[PDB]
Structures are given as C-alpha cells and as structure tokens.
C-alpha cells in the first residue's frame, strides 16, 4: 500500500483511478498557466486518461461491443472497470493479480452505484466459470502476458464474434521499447506478434490504430507533475524524493523513446 499510495497521489483520488497514458487529440499538451502546482498537472493527466477511454470507446463501438458481459484484464485500481460499468452499463469482471486492490475496485464500484455490475477476480490467467463473456479489454496490461497462452484462454471464455480490445505499447523494430520494457518489467512485442498469437487461437485482427503522437504529450505532463512535486513538497523523505527524481529521469527517457520511432502506442481489436 506504500506503492499504491504513491500511485493514488499522482492519479487519484477515487472513485475512478487510471494507470495508463492519456490521449491528447491535438497531439499537444495544454499550455502551462500560472497554476503549475502538482494538482494542476494531476487534474490534466486524469482528464486525458478519461479521454483515452472515451476515445477507445468510440473506435471500439463500445455502445454495442463493450456494454454486455466483459472482462477487464489487468484492471489496476478499477478506473477502466468503472468506466465501462458506469458509461456503457457493462457488467464487468475486473481481473487483477494484486489481492489488496480488489477491495479498492469493489468499494469504489459501490460508491458509484454499480457495485452489482462490477466483481473482481484475483488470479495470475484463470476461470472459465462465470459463463462466456462478450468481450475482454486490456488497457496497458498485456505487456505483462504470455500472449499465445492468454489468447488461447480468451478463446475458451469468449463467445463467437466477441471482441478483444487492447491498448498497448508495441515495438516497431527490435529494442524499440527497451526503456519502457526494463523500467516497467513488460515484454513489448510487435503488432504482428499479437496478430499471430491471436490467429493461432481463433481470433482475427479487425482494427489496428496508431495513437503514438496523441499519447506523447502524456510524458510531458507526467514529467511536469513530477518536477512540480520535487520543487514544492518539503515533506518528502530522502527516499521518497530520490524515487521521484528517478521517476523524472525515466519520464524524460520514456518520452524520448516515444518519439524515436521504435515504439508504437496502438489500439487493437480482435474478433473471435
């Protein structure tokens, strides 16, 4: 919960807490005003995180594809899960490998009046029980999976025609996302890698969208939030201040990697 509290400090507060990049339709960050407090950047980060889910819901046709029984795989603190439940009436099974996050997801779901439509599953992945699902959504979580196995499992729990919707960092050339990979412990692969994994399991790639330019401004706002905290928070412990300095360095390295050509922030949709 020390890790978690640091994440909530930056991306919260509840009820909807997101842990993924934000979407900037004009491909630029909002101009700095005279409010450059941490809170001003935190608000803007959250605004464009919501913006990513709203942009994904458009291109994915959430009204009919994400409004039934869906799996939220790698649900973080539940911000996506609550978004599909609240905004599209979906019944959501939110999957996390972190047991201490499961009551946070469920409590915020109650606070939003969708406690009946949001249930957690803790696993590393599992359960074919709990019927067949209309869809599975993975927002920046699949970098952690064995894609071949994951897609085979999905084939067993998704109805024919069901959709698999993915937002993810992909490589476009070897080592193109090494900074991302080593700092977040992900194994990014190419879009073709995901297509072949999905094909071997009975899924067809039906949509492939590049949103690299539109998500690049996230790193600028994330860097500015981190610098604002370092400049303005005198209560930081030496350890906490060192971690934020490290996060600032990684954020600059990550933004530069984002621009260097070897990385692709993509939205994918598969159909069983």
Ligand X SMILES: N[C@@H](CCCC[NH3+])C(=O)O
Query: Where do contacts with a copy of itself occur on this chain (CB under 8 A)?
Result: 8, 12-15, 35, 37, 39-40, 43, 104, 107-108, 110-113, 115, 124-129, 131, 148-149, 152-153, 156-157, 178-179, 182-183, 185, 196-197, 200, 230, 234, 238, 241-242, 245-246, 249-250, 252-253
The kind and range of the H/E element at 88 are helix 79-88
Q: Which of the listed partners (ligand X, a copy of itself, none) does 272 bind, with a CB threshold of 5 to 8 Å by partner kind? A: ligand X
Per DSSP, 143 falls in state: G
Nearer to a copy of itself, 110 or 173 (CB): 110
| Among the listed residues 204, 206, 233, 261, the single contact to ligand X using CB under 6 A | 204
| Among the listed residues 202, 212, 245, 253, the single contact to ligand X using CB under 6 A | 202
* C-alpha to C-alpha distance for 141 and 151, rounded to whole angstroms: 14
Q: Which of the listed partners (ligand X, a copy of itself, none) does 195 bind, with a CB threshold of 5 to 8 Å by partner kind? A: none
158-171 sheet: strands from edge to edge: 118-122, 91-96, 69-73, 133-139, 158-171, 263-271, 204-210
Q: How far is the CB of 123 from a copy of itself (least distance, A)?
A: 10
Residues 164, 208 contacting (CB under 8 angstroms): no
Residue closest to ligand X when measured from CB atoms: 160
Q: Any contact of residue 115 with ligand X (CB under 6 A)?
A: no
* C-alpha to C-alpha distance for 173 and 189, rounded to whole angstroms: 9
The kind and range of the H/E element at 170 are strand 158-171
DSSP letter string, 176-224: TTHHHHHHHT-----HHHHHHHHHHTT-EEEEEEE-HHHHTHHHHHHHH
Q: Which of the listed partners (ligand X, a copy of itself, none) does 68 bind, with a CB threshold of 5 to 8 Å by partner kind? A: none
Nearer to ligand X, 94 or 154 (CB): 154
Report residue 219 as tokens. 């790193």
Residues 88, 66 contacting (CB under 8 angstroms): yes
Binding residues among 233-272 for ligand X as defined by CB under 6 A:
272
Q: How far is the CB of 203 from ligand X (least distance, A)?
A: 6
Given the rule CB under 6 A, which residues bind ligand X? 160, 202, 204, 272
């Amino acid at each position: 919960d020390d890790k978690t509290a640091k994440l909530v400090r930056k991306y919260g507060p509840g009820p909807r807490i997101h842990y993924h990049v934000g979407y900037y339709p004009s491909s630029e960050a909002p101009r700095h005003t005279r409010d450059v407090t941490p809170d001003a950047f935190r608000r803007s980060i959250r605004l464009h995180q919501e913006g990513l889910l709203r942009y994904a819901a458009k291109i994915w046709g959430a009204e009919h594809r994400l409004s039934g029984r869906i799996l939220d795989v790698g649900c973080g603190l539940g911000g996506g899960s609550l978004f599909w439940a609240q905004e599209y009436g979906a019944d959501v099974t939110a999957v996390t490998n972190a047991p201490e996050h499961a009551p946070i997801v469920e409590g915020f779901a109650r606070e939003c009046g969708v406690g009946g439509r949001v249930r957690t599953l803790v696993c590393d992945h599992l359960p074919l029980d709990g019927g067949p699902y209309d869809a599975a959504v993975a927002i920046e979580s699949s970098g952690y999976f064995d894609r071949p196995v994951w897609f085979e499992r999905l084939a067993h729990v998704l109805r024919p025609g069901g959709s698999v919707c993915i937002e993810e960092v992909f490589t476009t050339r070897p080592h193109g996302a090494d900074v991302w990979a080593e700092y977040f412990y992900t194994k990014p692969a190419t879009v073709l890698d995901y297509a072949e994994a999905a094909k071997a399991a009975g899924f067809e790639l039906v949509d492939d969208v590049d949103a690299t330019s539109e998500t690049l401004p996230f790193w600028e706002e994330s860097t500015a939030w981190t610098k604002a905290v370092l400049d303005s928070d005198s209560t930081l412990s030496a350890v906490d201040r060192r971690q934020l300095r490290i996060s600032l360095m990684a954020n600059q390295a990550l933004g530069a990697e984002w621009q260097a050509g070897g990385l692709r922030l993509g939205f994918l949709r598969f159909e069983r």
